[PDB]
Amino acid sequence: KEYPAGEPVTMNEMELAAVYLQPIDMEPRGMGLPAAKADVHLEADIHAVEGNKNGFGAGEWIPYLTISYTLVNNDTGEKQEGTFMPMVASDGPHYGANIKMMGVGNYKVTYHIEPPSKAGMHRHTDSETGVGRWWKPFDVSYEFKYVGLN
């Protein structure tokens, strides 16, 4: 049971979507909220589309991103902020975190995305094997209605 958070959007030759699930157990455990103390596992789903200039083929996961989120309950104004961790689940690698939500309501979440160069991935720059410069850091936002999972 996976829940869409807003609509996927394409920016910088990547398709970027936000989704959530019931809370997960992660290894290493003890980092972040345990499933029992969270309402959802929120993810950033990010893959190359056709035309990617940074060396990724269409559909490939984009690794080494640094992603922060700012989550606002629009009904109350209460917010929370954090960073996602890279992880892998049975249908592949993604970025995510367990999240305790802030009640039923209309939410907005914004993901601030930093390119792979900022977490240790290097690019070939020669004419023979090289790729283009990385895109500049950017934001994407999603609006969704949270009603709980049960």
Next chain:
Amino acid sequence: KEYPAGEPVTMNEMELAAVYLQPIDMEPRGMGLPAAKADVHLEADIHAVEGNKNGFGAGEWIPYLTISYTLVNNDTGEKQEGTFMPMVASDGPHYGANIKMMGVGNYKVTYHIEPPSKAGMHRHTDSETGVGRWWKPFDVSYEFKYVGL
């Protein structure tokens, strides 16, 4: 991927090959060997194969690995230790480094490989979407004859 280094190995539901090519330029050339001071760019080409239990589909690049190498010129006995960086080129992501070789001859290179957990990748362990435990760190070796480029 220009010059194959030995034969690919399939282990831990990954195919692992070594290749080298001419020295390349890297952004921003940080802690690494400049192309003008190197003989080759040596790479680890590592992708999941079918039955991978760690969440990767067939042919997918394995990200977040930590890889070091031990390179031995078997003819002279001279040894070199170093590490690879994650790297993207026109044909996709890989791990590699510019390397100064130790003369022409028969070589062995061993890659020492640590799983994505060491570089900060977490795993779902839940029943519905969880994956198996990571494999333990391991070595893969390649024998090749280096004659220059």
